[PDB]
Design a protein around this motif. Structure first.
Motif, short mmCIF file in Angstrom:
data_model
loop_
_atom_site.label_atom_id
_atom_site.label_comp_id
_atom_site.label_asym_id
_atom_site.label_seq_id
_atom_site.Cartn_x
_atom_site.Cartn_y
_atom_site.Cartn_z
N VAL A 1 -0.41 2.75 -10.39
CA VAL A 1 -0.73 1.59 -9.58
C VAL A 1 -2.09 1.82 -8.96
CG1 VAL A 1 0.01 0.15 -7.68
CG2 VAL A 1 1.71 1.24 -9.13
N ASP A 2 -2.97 0.84 -9.08
CA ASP A 2 -4.19 0.86 -8.30
C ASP A 2 -3.84 0.70 -6.84
OD1 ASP A 2 -6.54 -0.56 -6.84
OD2 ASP A 2 -7.47 0.05 -8.73
N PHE A 3 -4.46 1.51 -5.99
CA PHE A 3 -4.45 1.26 -4.56
C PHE A 3 -5.86 1.30 -4.00
CE2 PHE A 3 0.02 3.04 -4.63
CZ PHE A 3 0.60 1.81 -4.50
N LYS A 4 -6.84 1.06 -4.85
CA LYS A 4 -8.24 1.23 -4.50
C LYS A 4 -9.07 -0.02 -4.72
CE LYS A 4 -7.25 4.93 -6.40
NZ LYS A 4 -6.04 5.76 -6.63
N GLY B 1 -16.96 -6.93 -6.89
CA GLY B 1 -17.83 -7.97 -7.40
C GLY B 1 -17.26 -8.80 -8.53
N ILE B 2 -16.63 -8.15 -9.51
CA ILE B 2 -16.22 -8.81 -10.74
C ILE B 2 -14.99 -9.66 -10.47
CG2 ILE B 2 -17.05 -6.70 -11.79
CD1 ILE B 2 -14.27 -6.23 -12.86
N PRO B 3 -14.73 -10.70 -11.26
CA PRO B 3 -13.51 -11.47 -11.06
C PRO B 3 -12.40 -10.99 -11.97
CG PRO B 3 -14.88 -12.65 -12.55
CD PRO B 3 -15.63 -11.38 -12.20
N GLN C 1 -10.23 -11.71 -6.82
CA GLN C 1 -11.65 -11.35 -6.79
C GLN C 1 -11.80 -10.17 -5.84
OE1 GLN C 1 -10.91 -14.50 -5.32
NE2 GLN C 1 -10.81 -15.62 -7.25
N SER C 2 -11.63 -8.96 -6.35
CA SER C 2 -11.80 -7.79 -5.50
C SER C 2 -13.28 -7.58 -5.23
CB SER C 2 -11.19 -6.57 -6.17
OG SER C 2 -11.56 -6.51 -7.53
N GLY C 3 -13.67 -7.60 -3.96
CA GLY C 3 -15.05 -7.34 -3.62
C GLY C 3 -15.40 -7.85 -2.24
N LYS D 1 -8.25 -15.96 0.17
CA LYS D 1 -7.06 -16.45 -0.50
C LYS D 1 -6.09 -15.29 -0.58
CE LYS D 1 -6.14 -19.02 -3.70
NZ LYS D 1 -5.27 -19.60 -2.65
N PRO D 2 -4.79 -15.54 -0.62
CA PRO D 2 -3.84 -14.43 -0.70
C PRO D 2 -3.90 -13.73 -2.04
CG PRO D 2 -2.81 -16.39 0.20
CD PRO D 2 -4.11 -16.82 -0.36
N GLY D 3 -4.49 -12.54 -2.06
CA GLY D 3 -4.65 -11.80 -3.30
C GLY D 3 -5.97 -11.06 -3.39
N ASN D 4 -6.89 -11.35 -2.49
CA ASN D 4 -8.21 -10.75 -2.57
C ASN D 4 -8.21 -9.35 -1.95
OD1 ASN D 4 -8.92 -14.03 -2.14
ND2 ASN D 4 -9.83 -12.94 -3.86
N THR D 5 -9.40 -8.77 -1.83
CA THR D 5 -9.58 -7.41 -1.32
C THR D 5 -11.02 -7.25 -0.87
OG1 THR D 5 -7.80 -6.35 -2.55
CG2 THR D 5 -9.72 -4.99 -1.97
N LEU D 6 -11.22 -6.87 0.40
CA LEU D 6 -12.54 -6.83 0.99
C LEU D 6 -12.48 -5.94 2.22
CD1 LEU D 6 -12.72 -9.07 3.68
CD2 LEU D 6 -12.07 -10.52 1.78
N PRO D 7 -13.53 -5.18 2.52
CA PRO D 7 -13.47 -4.28 3.68
C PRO D 7 -13.46 -5.03 4.99
CG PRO D 7 -15.02 -3.48 2.09
CD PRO D 7 -14.66 -4.86 1.65
N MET D 8 -13.09 -4.30 6.04
CA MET D 8 -12.56 -4.91 7.24
C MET D 8 -13.62 -5.28 8.25
SD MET D 8 -9.03 -2.69 7.56
CE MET D 8 -8.47 -3.33 9.12
N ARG D 9 -14.90 -5.18 7.90
CA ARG D 9 -15.88 -5.93 8.67
C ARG D 9 -15.69 -7.42 8.46
NH1 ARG D 9 -19.94 -1.45 7.77
NH2 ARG D 9 -19.50 -2.03 5.59
#
Ligand SMILES: [Mg+2]
Ligand SMILES: [Mg+2]
Ligand SMILES: [Mg+2]
Ligand SMILES: [Mg+2]
Ligand SMILES: [Mg+2]
Ligand SMILES: [Mg+2]
Ligand SMILES: [Mg+2]
Ligand SMILES: [Mg+2]
Ligand SMILES: [Mg+2]
Ligand SMILES: [Mg+2]
Ligand SMILES: [Mg+2]
Ligand SMILES: [Mg+2]
Ligand SMILES: [Mg+2]
Ligand SMILES: [Mg+2]
Ligand SMILES: [Mg+2]
Ligand SMILES: [Mg+2]
Ligand SMILES: [Mg+2]
Ligand SMILES: [Mg+2]
Ligand SMILES: [Mg+2]
Ligand SMILES: [Mg+2]
Ligand SMILES: [Mg+2]
Ligand SMILES: [Mg+2]
Ligand SMILES: [Mg+2]
Ligand SMILES: [Mg+2]
Ligand SMILES: [Mg+2]
Ligand SMILES: [Mg+2]
Ligand SMILES: [Mg+2]
Ligand SMILES: [Mg+2]
Ligand SMILES: [Mg+2]
Ligand SMILES: [Mg+2]
Ligand SMILES: [Mg+2]
Ligand SMILES: [Mg+2]
Ligand SMILES: [Mg+2]
Ligand SMILES: [Mg+2]
Ligand SMILES: [Mg+2]
Ligand SMILES: [Mg+2]
Ligand SMILES: [Mg+2]
Ligand SMILES: [Mg+2]
Ligand SMILES: [Mg+2]
Ligand SMILES: [Mg+2]
Ligand SMILES: [Mg+2]
Ligand SMILES: [Mg+2]
Ligand SMILES: [Mg+2]
Ligand SMILES: [Mg+2]
Ligand SMILES: [Mg+2]
Ligand SMILES: [Mg+2]
Ligand SMILES: [Mg+2]
Ligand SMILES: [Mg+2]
Ligand SMILES: [Mg+2]
Ligand SMILES: [Mg+2]
Ligand SMILES: [Mg+2]
Ligand SMILES: [Mg+2]
Ligand SMILES: [Mg+2]
Ligand SMILES: [Mg+2]
Ligand SMILES: [Mg+2]
Ligand SMILES: [Mg+2]
Ligand SMILES: [Mg+2]
Ligand SMILES: [Mg+2]
Ligand SMILES: [Mg+2]
Ligand SMILES: [Mg+2]
Ligand SMILES: [Mg+2]
Ligand SMILES: [Mg+2]
Ligand SMILES: [Mg+2]
Ligand SMILES: [Mg+2]
Ligand SMILES: [Mg+2]
Ligand SMILES: [Mg+2]
Ligand SMILES: [Mg+2]
Ligand SMILES: [Mg+2]
Ligand SMILES: [Mg+2]
Lengths: 271, 94, 46, 22
Positions: A64-67, A72-74, A116-118, A124-132
RNA sequence: GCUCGCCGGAAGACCAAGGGUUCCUGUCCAACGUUAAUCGGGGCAGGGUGAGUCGACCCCUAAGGCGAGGCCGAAAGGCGUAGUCGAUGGGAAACAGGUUAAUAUUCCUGUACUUGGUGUUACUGCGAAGGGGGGACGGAGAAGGCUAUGUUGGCCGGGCGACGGUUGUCCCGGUUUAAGCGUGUAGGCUGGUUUUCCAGGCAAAUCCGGAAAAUCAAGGCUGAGGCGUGAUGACGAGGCACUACGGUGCUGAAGCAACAAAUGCCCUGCUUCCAGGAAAAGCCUCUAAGCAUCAGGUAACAUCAAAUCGUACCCCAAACCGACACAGGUGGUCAGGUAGAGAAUACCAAGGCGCUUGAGAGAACUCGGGUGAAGGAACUAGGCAAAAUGGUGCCGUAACUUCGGGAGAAGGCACGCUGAUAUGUAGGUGAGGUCCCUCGCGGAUGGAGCUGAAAUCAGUCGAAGAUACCAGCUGGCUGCAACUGUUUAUUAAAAACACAGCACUGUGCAAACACGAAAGUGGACGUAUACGGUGUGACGCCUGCCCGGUGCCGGAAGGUUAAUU
RNA sequence: AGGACCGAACCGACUAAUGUUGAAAAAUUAGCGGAUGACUUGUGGCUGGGGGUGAAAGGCCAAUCAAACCGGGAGAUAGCU
């Protein structure tokens, strides 16, 4: 959903399965599988270091990815699959350049949407972005603690964790247990809760599922003989001492958190 | 090619038996008794250049000896490899 | 009843045999004792 | 010939707790 | 040698882990066999295992073990990295017949198959400690085609039956033939193919994966079985003969069909459920460090080779473990006829054994057994024992409930045999012959033959028709735990324990806790809907008062106090 | 579909007689329960004695267990026989 079964037998009276019918049968997508059998709690040195663990069915550890390293990429999701190890459901995903990974399912991820991880991510529910870059008040799961270690916060099947405020390069996390923890701005995060939130509604039903899940019958105290546990024996049913663990520490409310180490992050414990 | 010094040690005796006295005529085969470190090379090159005769193919086994009791104390005879050596069409020993 | 001892050489000679008692430490404190009496059946190799 | 001379069976202490006098 | 008993999912055959001459003849009787002994698993002497294919060794890994370094520990040592070890599993191969007093898939004729280096024949991208596809996988039921085998007929050979019949619709016996090589099968799987692209697969990839675009009705994969070929051979009922009358040598017809049919194959498949179901290698394949018109590469074939070791014997036993030739204990492989649902049980075959003391008489009494006048629990701790019920089809079936059950509730009736419905149908299988066909192991199609229950109605027989074996005692009112489970091997299965459900409390992940002084290791390659600890045990209604003792939680103005000073 | 039922092999040990210097230092006989599962089982790896393992009985760790067994200080010691 919460499908009930009927009294066809002794035993099968209090079962309720949870069916999410979007989960596909067939085979898991093979080149992210390996082998992790269970040692039944027995450590390398041979003793038992956690009790009641033994038996159950043979399980395969899905990588499992946890990272979410590919920023950037979709990408688009491909399938939803039944995880064997954690209680949640996993999402077999398709990166655009050709790889496939496994992301824990947000509660809105039907089979067919996109993520869209980046740092450029949508909200949207599903993304990933740092907490700034999370706007506060949000419902964030899959939270790390250090800038790239792996998510260890709100990773279960039904959890979610709030961001409550900010101060500088620190952001304040109200966890599911209700402990305000300051954390750094770079630690990875997501949006929304996780998917199989009705998992806590599922009850087991019979001793069979306890042995299938892996938990052995936990031996209760006051009937054990008084050499092998301090709740011992006595001809009859006598208990009148203080309730303790097998190793002398009393239990019901006694703190055994034994750190002065992470005091400077923990704001306040719960009630 | 096995050297002659190693070749000349590999035999002890032919082996008289009823199955030798059937395999001599009715199937034309011979019954050696070789040393224990003998392979099919060390008998296929050893029936040839010791009687100046020919060979079809060789076979062996490892007979394990019996248990004897001379007096009242136990005894174990030495094991010994028994070799069956088939001779070609048109062959006859001395 | 199933007796005290149901034999299996494939484990007997690796859990009692000569290289097993040579691998550890105090097996060399049993092979250092059986020669004091001088055991002609030294260990459990057949 | 000759033969040995057996002995010393595990004689089970010859009794249970039979004489229950109480 | 002939009867007579007995097993026949064992007490039969072959092997497993095990045992170490027990196997086979020539002897020999002292000891050994709960006897005598020519006999013996006993002594004594000799004889006895054959492989490119079966198995081990070997190529590859799981759980673990070892483990240079390194980290850690008074020292030994302790885990642990790369590795290298580790079968019960994954990977080359082949069979049928004959033979000895003993082995033989190993010996012999027969005919096949693989895997390695070779030399040449034309072909000229091989290259990898790396990249991917594969090997590659759970449980249940459900069918579809099939054979191993079984039955019957046709045939062939023998016989005309010790006593009433028995040249007939009669009786016996036999009717077997393999891998391999072509056949691509009932079915199962899956849309293929180039054109160009591509933040990816550690780097590159011509290989995967993805993005398209064009474009086709179809590409293979996968396979049991049957037919072919293997096949003039082998066996083959038995006759033909002498010899060591034990044997053997020499001959040898029929060798077909139908139906039945698995717990064996496809199936490592399908469907579908959740507790979500190994790795690596052999192989398929792509590439760089490397390349040279070389080498290597598969396309050929003459080859040359393919070890070493296991191989005898018993294997649910007189040969192993139990001190004994002991009612004991152990795993996997094959299941024949007849009534039955069936590997139960009953009687039988092929094969096996008849139990290492036997004879005599028929006392008390003991054990294992059959039946009983009359009464039915009066016996006694208590119906303990015994007896009795017992099978399908159909009718019929309560209070009570969580609606499922109770329930198979209770209680009933029917049933053996012969004939008729129908000279054996209803049901299945299915060749004759057309028929069309992408001609094949194809079907559209049709009924010969074959097998085939129950039913009904009539008749008859028995004291008795599920006759033997086999095969539930049932209701009534109760405590106790919800239950299925499991424990004191060797006196206690219970009211014990454990369970799901609940309640609390701990634990923010280097968790919490435990083993180890530590290194680390579990927990967990998990993350508060998770884990640990304790308490009680399904659901149904419910879980009231008290913080003084006692503990635990927080709070810190004062009293109280170490090490230091 | 079932910790569903009846009932084989297999397990298991409830009841009763026999057997108790028995055939066997825990079994035969006749009845019994589980019997697609919390099962049973082949073979193999792991757990060390104040320790393990335990549906927890103070049961089991080689027929021995409220601290296994084998040497040693051991000529422990015994005010009792
Ligand atoms: Mg517990
Ligand atoms: Mg519990
Ligand atoms: Mg204590
Ligand atoms: Mg009390
Ligand atoms: Mg050991
Ligand atoms: Mg009989
Ligand atoms: Mg037998
Ligand atoms: Mg002998
Ligand atoms: Mg003999
Ligand atoms: Mg005698
Ligand atoms: Mg005499
Ligand atoms: Mg004899
Ligand atoms: Mg003998
Ligand atoms: Mg050989
Ligand atoms: Mg040969
Ligand atoms: Mg390892
Ligand atoms: Mg080690
Ligand atoms: Mg070292
Ligand atoms: Mg290896
Ligand atoms: Mg193996
Ligand atoms: Mg293997
Ligand atoms: Mg092989
Ligand atoms: Mg034999
Ligand atoms: Mg590969
Ligand atoms: Mg299956
Ligand atoms: Mg057939
Ligand atoms: Mg046939
Ligand atoms: Mg007559
Ligand atoms: Mg007559
Ligand atoms: Mg054939
Ligand atoms: Mg044999
Ligand atoms: Mg026996
Ligand atoms: Mg004994
Ligand atoms: Mg039968
Ligand atoms: Mg039977
Ligand atoms: Mg006898
Ligand atoms: Mg009498
Ligand atoms: Mg009677
Ligand atoms: Mg009478
Ligand atoms: Mg009477
Ligand atoms: Mg009467
Ligand atoms: Mg009375
Ligand atoms: Mg009375
Ligand atoms: Mg009374
Ligand atoms: Mg009774
Ligand atoms: Mg009776
Ligand atoms: Mg009462
Ligand atoms: Mg009970
Ligand atoms: Mg109670
Ligand atoms: Mg029960
Ligand atoms: Mg138990
Ligand atoms: Mg007892
Ligand atoms: Mg419990
Ligand atoms: Mg209780
Ligand atoms: Mg208080
Ligand atoms: Mg208090
Ligand atoms: Mg306090
Ligand atoms: Mg038991
Ligand atoms: Mg009992
Ligand atoms: Mg019995
Ligand atoms: Mg049953
Ligand atoms: Mg059942
Ligand atoms: Mg207890
Ligand atoms: Mg007690
Ligand atoms: Mg014991
Ligand atoms: Mg002790
Ligand atoms: Mg002690
Ligand atoms: Mg001393
Ligand atoms: Mg003394």
């Amino acid at each position: 959903a919460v499908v009930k079964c009927k009294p066809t037998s002794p035993g099968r009276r209090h079962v309720v399965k949870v069916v999410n019918p979007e989960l596909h049968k067939g085979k898991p997508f093979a080149p992210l599988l390996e082998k992790n059998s269970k040692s039944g709690g027995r450590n390398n040195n041979g003793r038992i270091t956690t009790r009641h663990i033994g038996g159950g069915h043979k399980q395969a550890y899905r990588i499992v990815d946890f990272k979410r390293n590919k920023d950037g990429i979709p990408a688009v999701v491909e399938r939803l699959e039944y995880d064997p190890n954690r209680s949640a459901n996993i999402a077999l995903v398709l990166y655009k350049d050709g790889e496939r990974r496994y992301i824990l399912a947000p509660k809105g991820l039907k089979a067919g949407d996109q993520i869209q991880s980046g740092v450029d991510a949508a909200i949207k529910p599903g993304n990933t972005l740092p907490m700034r870059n999370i706007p506060v008040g949000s419902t964030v799961h899959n939270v790390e603690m250090k800038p790239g270690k792996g998510g260890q916060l709100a990773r279960s099947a039904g959890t979610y964790v709030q961001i409550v405020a900010r101060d500088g390069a620190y952001v304040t996390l109200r966890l599911r247990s209700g402990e305000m923890r300051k954390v750094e701005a770079d630690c990875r995060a997501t949006l929304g809760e996780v998917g199989n939130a009705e998992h806590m509604l599922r009850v087991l039903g019979k001793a069979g599922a306890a042995r299938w899940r892996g938990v052995r019958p936990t031996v209760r105290g006051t009937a054990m003989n008084p050499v092998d546990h301090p709740h011992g024996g006595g001809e009859g049913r006598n208990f009148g001492k203080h309730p303790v663990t097998p190793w002398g520490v009393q239990t019901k409310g006694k703190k055994t958190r034994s750190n002065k180490r992470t005091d400077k992050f923990i704001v306040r414990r719960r009630s | 090619m096995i050297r002659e010094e190693r070749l000349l040690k590999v035999l002890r005796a032919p082996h008289v038996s009823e199955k030798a006295s059937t395999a001599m005529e009715k199937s034309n085969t011979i019954v050696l008794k070789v040393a224990k470190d003998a392979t099919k090379a060390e008998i296929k090159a050893a029936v040839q250049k010791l009687f100046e005769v020919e060979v079809e193919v060789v076979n062996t086994l490892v007979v394990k000896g019996k248990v004897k009791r001379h007096g009242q104390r136990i005894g174990r005879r030495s094991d010994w490899k028994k070799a069956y050596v088939t001779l070609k069409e048109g062959q006859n020993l001395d | 009843m199933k007796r005290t001892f149901q034999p299996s050489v494939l484990k007997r000679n690796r859990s009692h045999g000569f290289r097993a008692r040579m691998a550890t430490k105090n097996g060399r404190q049993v092979l250092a004792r059986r020669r004091a009496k001088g055991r002609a059946r030294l260990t459990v190799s057949k | 010939a000759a033969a040995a001379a057996a002995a010393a069976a595990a004689a089970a202490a010859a009794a249970a707790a039979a004489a229950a006098a109480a």
